[PDB]
Amino acid sequence: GSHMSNISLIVGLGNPGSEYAQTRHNAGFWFVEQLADKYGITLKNDPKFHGISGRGNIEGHDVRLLLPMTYMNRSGQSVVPFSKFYQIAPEAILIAHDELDMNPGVIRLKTGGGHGGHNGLRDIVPHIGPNFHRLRIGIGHPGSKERVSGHVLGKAPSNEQSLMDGAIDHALSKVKLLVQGQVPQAMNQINAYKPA
Ligand SMILES: [Cl-]
Ligand SMILES: [Cl-]
Ligand SMILES: [Cl-]
Ligand code: NA
Ligand code: NA
Ligand code: NA
Ligand code: NA
Ligand code: NA
Ligand code: NA
Ligand code: NA
Ligand code: NA
Ligand code: NA
Ligand code: NA
Ligand code: NA
Ligand code: NA
Ligand code: NA
Numbered sequence: 001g002s003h004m005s006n007i008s009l010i011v012g013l014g015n016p017g018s019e020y021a022q023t024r025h026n027a028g029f030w031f032v033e034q035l036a037d038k039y040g041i042t043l044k045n046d047p048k049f050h051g052i053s054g055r056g057n058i059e060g061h062d063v064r065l066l067l068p069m070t071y072m073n074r075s076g077q078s079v080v081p082f083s084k085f086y087q088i089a090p091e092a093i094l095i096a097h098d099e100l101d102m103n104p105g106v107i108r109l110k111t112g113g114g115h116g117g118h119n120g121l122r123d124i125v126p127h128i129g130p131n132f133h134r135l136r137i138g139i140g141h142p143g144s145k146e147r148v149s150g151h152v153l154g155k156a157p158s159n160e161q162s163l164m165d166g167a168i169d170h171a172l173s174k175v176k177l178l179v180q181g182q183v184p185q186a187m188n189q190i191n192a193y194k195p196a
Contacts, residue, residue, distance in 0.1 A: 001087025006181040007133065009064050009088045010035065011079055013097045013120040016069045025072060025152040027137040028096035028120075031168050032065055038172055041065055049082040050074075061179040064088070068120075076123035083128060093132040094178060096171075097121060098152060102138030105163030105195035107171055109187040110134045117148070133183065135171055135190070137164060163195050 012032030068078035
């Protein structure tokens with residue numbers, strides 16, 4: 001299984017299909033797909049766990065990657081059995097997700113806390129508890145609550161997309177610290193990011 005707070009499972013949240021791939025709610029997929037390409041980790045079909053997954057070496061550590069293919073609000077149907085099967089404790093899990101409560105171009109690493117309204121986290125925390133790490137990728141808020149679906153299922157304008165892409169790129173450079181268990185240093189260096 002996992003070992004302490006070395007990160008050994010990195011999950012990206014999102015919805016499946018081309019119609020959702022460019023939407024804000026897929027920010028976690030963007031991160032994990034880019035990470036997989038950086039390290040040469042194959043993301044392959046994983047029907048057993050209702051997702052796409054991979055396994056490979058990140059900086060001398062054996063790490064698994066997971067993209068649930070359940071639709072966002074059923075993400076736990078992938079993350080929970082996968083983590084349990086591989087004996088990965090929540091403390092060794094990083095979940096990358098879009099964050100309505102932060103601006104595009106802001107990115108933060110957080111440990112613990114609730115779902116903050118996020119319908120994918122809402123499907124995970126009841127089962128494994130809150131004590132996993134989160135890479136909160138700011139996407140902005142549409143103002144009102146009635147609008148949240150339309151915002152998160154929208155494709156950001158180019159300025160916002162550029163800001164998010166830069167923040168994601170910065171976080172990819174800090175995965176080495178996470179897989180090494182240097183969560184405090186990673187948190188400081190991720191949370192310090194600014195776009196300009
Ligand atoms: Cl959704
Ligand atoms: Cl935070
Ligand atoms: Cl459960
Ligand atoms: Na681990
Ligand atoms: Na998901
Ligand atoms: Na590949
Ligand atoms: Na490496
Ligand atoms: Na999904
Ligand atoms: Na399931
Ligand atoms: Na961002
Ligand atoms: Na979070
Ligand atoms: Na929108
Ligand atoms: Na977008
Ligand atoms: Na940028
Ligand atoms: Na550290
Ligand atoms: Na440390």
